[PDB]
Design a protein around this ligand. Structure first.
Ligand SMILES: CCCCCCCC[C@@H](Br)[C@@H](Br)CCCCCCCC(=O)O[C@@H](COC(=O)CCCCCCC[C@@H](Br)[C@@H](Br)CCCCCCCC)COP(=O)(O)O[C@@H]1[C@H](O)[C@H](O)[C@@H](O)[C@H](O)[C@H]1O
Ligand SMILES: CCCCCCCC/C=C\CCCCCCCC(=O)OC[C@H](COP(=O)(O)OCC[N+](C)(C)C)OC(=O)CCCCCCC/C=C\CCCCCCCC
Ligand code: NA
Lengths: 121, 284
């Protein structure tokens, strides 16, 4: 019963909150990565994949803020990175936690009923 | 009569002054919601989807043109007899055309609506954001033809604004449209309060012999990258305890509270946004 309901909650969270969050997060990440890589003149990080990975490192608490220096207008680079950090890390990821708490609050009976139907199947 | 079209009721509610007591709630009245849904499902869903597709194509072409910008120095850059250079230049022309299109669309909005300088910067955030993206694109063009490399700075701010503006089209889908209304309400209320207090604390504790370097080192703590030995211990521990362990968790808690109380208000605001979209499509 307990693990069953926990798995049902995981399913519900993956289908609603993770989905909505991943769409908005991927849009922001691609936009800010296309901006940063365009600003970069050349070097190791002059590819879309490398810059996307560098900006995704921020989501997992491993962002550098100085991962490259092959650019002009350091102010432009710093402002872009700070905007990306404030929009994703400090806002969107905490909002995901807050929306996950609301979902937990509202899907107890639904999650127990779904588990019971699964066991009936 | 005088509901669908006339001062029609729908055009009165949608284009209200943002001081109206129940601007978001008057659309819940029985006939109006069902009329707006009818207009949506009949013709405004298809028109809006076409607009979204066109905007996605525009952003893809702009991203491709900016990605393959030449690095030679002191524009303008002479076109070579290469197919790739012919694709890049046509993409750039399309990007500038879209920027001009959005600039003129913002001017037309500010003219026909005449915002009162408070609802200008308190409501209609989408119009201002698209207009500012267009402004960045036009400034980029002006700098580009002035032989200035700062054109790239204006262009990359236009690109990040244009990709972040794709969140406008989340309206037209209820779940994503309400999530985007909830993102707006978090940004205006919780992020603002937290950022004011957080910036005060950061500047105080920061005040590596330069202010910028120490501010960056102390901001690294917020993103889970703080060193604690980057170059004193009591100051760093006080800053960590007051920002990382207290204020950032308090932000999460307050965000949870907001989400709990804005559920109904977030749906009403999304419905009003879609009504505005349906009226704009009808008029144009
Ligand atoms: C504060 C933001 C909140 C406003 C907002 O944005 O949400 C509005 C939607 O906006 C959009 O288009 C989505 C764009 C948000 C993308 C993320 C932010 C990116 C910018 Br910020 C930067 Br990071 C990119 C540069 C990044 C590069 C960094 C470099 C820096 C130099 C909603 O407002 P509305 O559409 O007008 O509807 C109103 C409604 O009708 C009315 O009835 C109600 O009353 C009002 O409330 C409205 O709902
Ligand atoms: C041609 C079709 C033009 C068109 O139908 O408009 C579609 C797009 C999007 O326009 P929108 O009003 O829906 O965006 C919201 C803007 N706001 C906030 C001002 C309402 O406009 C455009 O990018 C048109 C310019 C893009 C040209 C490159 C084509 C790819
Ligand atoms: Na970390």
């Amino acid at each position: 019963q307990q693990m069953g309901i926990y798995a049902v909650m995981i399913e519900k969270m993956i289908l609603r909150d993770l989905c909505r969050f991943m769409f908005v997060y991927l849009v922001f990440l691609f936009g800010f990565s296309t901006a940063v890589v365009t600003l970069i003149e050349d070097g190791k990080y002059n590819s879309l994949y490398s810059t996307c990975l560098e900006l995704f490192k921020f989501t997992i608490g491993m962002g550098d803020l100085e991962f490259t220096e092959n650019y002009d207008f350091k102010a432009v680079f710093i402002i872009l990175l700070l905007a990306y950090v404030i929009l994703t890390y400090i806002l969107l990821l905490n909002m995901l936690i807050a929306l996950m708490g609301e979902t937990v609050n509202k899907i107890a009976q639904e999650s127990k009923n779904i588990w019971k139907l699964q066991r009936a199947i």
